Amino acid sequence: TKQHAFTREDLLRCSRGELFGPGNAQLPAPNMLMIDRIVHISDVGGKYGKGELVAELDINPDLWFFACHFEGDPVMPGCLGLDAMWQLVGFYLGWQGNPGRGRALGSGEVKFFGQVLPTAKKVTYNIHIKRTINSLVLAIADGTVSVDGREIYSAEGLRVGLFTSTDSF
Amino acid sequence: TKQHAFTREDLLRCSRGELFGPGNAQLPAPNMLMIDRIVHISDVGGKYGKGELVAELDINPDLWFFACHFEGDPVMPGCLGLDAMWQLVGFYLGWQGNPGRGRALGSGEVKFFGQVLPTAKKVTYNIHIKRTINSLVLAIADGTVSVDGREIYSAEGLRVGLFTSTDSF
Numbered sequence: 201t202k203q204h205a206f207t208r209e210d211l212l213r214c215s216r217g218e219l220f221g222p223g224n225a226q227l228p229a230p231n232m233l234m235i236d237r238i239v240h241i242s243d244v245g246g247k248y249g250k251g252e253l254v255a256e257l258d259i260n261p262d263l264w265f266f267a268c269h270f271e272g273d274p275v276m277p278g279c280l281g282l283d284a285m286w287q288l289v290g291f292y293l294g295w296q297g298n299p300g301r302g303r304a305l306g307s308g309e310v311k312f313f314g315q316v317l318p319t320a321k322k323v324t325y326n327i328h329i330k331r332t333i334n335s336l337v338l339a340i341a342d343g344t345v346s347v348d349g350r351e352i353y354s355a356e357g358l359r360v361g362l363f364t365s366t367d368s369f
Numbered sequence: 370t371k372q373h374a375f376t377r378e379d380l381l382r383c384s385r386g387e388l389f390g391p392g393n394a395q396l397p398a399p400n401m402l403m404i405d406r407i408v409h410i411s412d413v414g415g416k417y418g419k420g421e422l423v424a425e426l427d428i429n430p431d432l433w434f435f436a437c438h439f440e441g442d443p444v445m446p447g448c449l450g451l452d453a454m455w456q457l458v459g460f461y462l463g464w465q466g467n468p469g470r471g472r473a474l475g476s477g478e479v480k481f482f483g484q485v486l487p488t489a490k491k492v493t494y495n496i497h498i499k500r501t502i503n504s505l506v507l508a509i510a511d512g513t514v515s516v517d518g519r520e521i522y523s524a525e526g527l528r529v530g531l532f533t534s535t536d537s538f
């Protein structure tokens with residue numbers, strides 16, 4: 201609950217398990233990491249009064265996914281923008297001090313109504329925590345993805361849980 | 370509608386635009402390609418009588434996503450299994466002979482209730498086409514992801530569209 205913004209170096213330390221500690225929530229390392237900075241995190245406010253994250257990803261034409269997705273038709277995979285929203289809900293649970301490894305549990309409705317081209321400058325994730333539940337610790341959230349000011353994706357009911365050292369599916 | 374099974378080499382040709390032709394549906398190239406083979410495709414049968422795909426991904430411990438997702442806690446990203454299901458609905462539309470580039474438009478409910486560990490042998494995608502619509506050509510489908518016989522993910526209302534040479538969001 202202490203730090204309210206995170207640099208790329210903080211997120212890389214998070215990917216190594218060195219932000220929240222071993223066995224606690226981790227962000228992916230490159231090349232699955234789809235966040236450069238967390239600009240804002242709070243446990244109050246947001247759309248539901250249960251907290252909020254704002255995060256950013258810098259875009260340049262040399263990002264790996266543009267070359268393979270698709271050849272002659274470069275576009276950021278929608279699945280990776282959706283993934284960033286799950287990863288941020290996991291980061292939220294770890295930031296609150298809960299123990300365990302993050303797992304995405306699913307989502308209600310996802311809509312893609314725009315795309316991230318290699319000319320774009322910045323993707324912004326807005327995450328609104330809707331509820332946190334305690335057999336598992338889990339969070340439910342809504343999220344949007346925007347590119348250069350324009351909303352392009354929405355997700356309702358993102359669900360992420362934490363799995364202690366004994367938890368399996 | 371001609372070939373009913375596809376090898377990895379066919380899917381790589383598809384990723385180059387050389388299966389359905391330039392400007393038509395493409396699978397991603399490595400490292401976003403999450404399918405090794407299409408074992409079965411039909412435009413009849415399936416759960417809704419509007420067609421079916423069965424596809425497979427071989428798992429081994431050296432797949433790139435295990436090293437970065439997560440360090441000390443390797444698990445196939447759920448977003449990439451979900452992505453394979455969108456990519457197969459796109460492949461279906463191209464296989465029917467429709468023109469245009471594929472874009473995922475979203476999904477109804479997604480559930481993850483299992484995980485793909487680096488000890489697993491094979492992921493299987495089962496896609497049931499629910500409806501195809503003609504301003505855009507689009508398909509709606511349900512899908513499951515299974516690992517070594519065990520169902521682990523479900524998606525209802527996967528939605529994929531085709532964008533001609535003039536189409537934007």
Ligand SMILES: CCc1ccc(S(N)(=O)=O)cc1
Pocket residue numbers: 276277278279280394395396452455456458459460470471472473529
């Ligand atoms: C070719 C169909 C298609 C197109 C784009 C995606 S995306 N952008 O990975 O979610 C998935 C599937």
Ligand SMILES: CCc1ccc(S(N)(=O)=O)cc1
Pocket residue numbers: 225226227283286287289290291301302303304360445446447448449
């Ligand atoms: C750490 C939270 C988390 C855990 C796993 C995923 S997944 N497997 O990329 O969909 C996403 C987010």
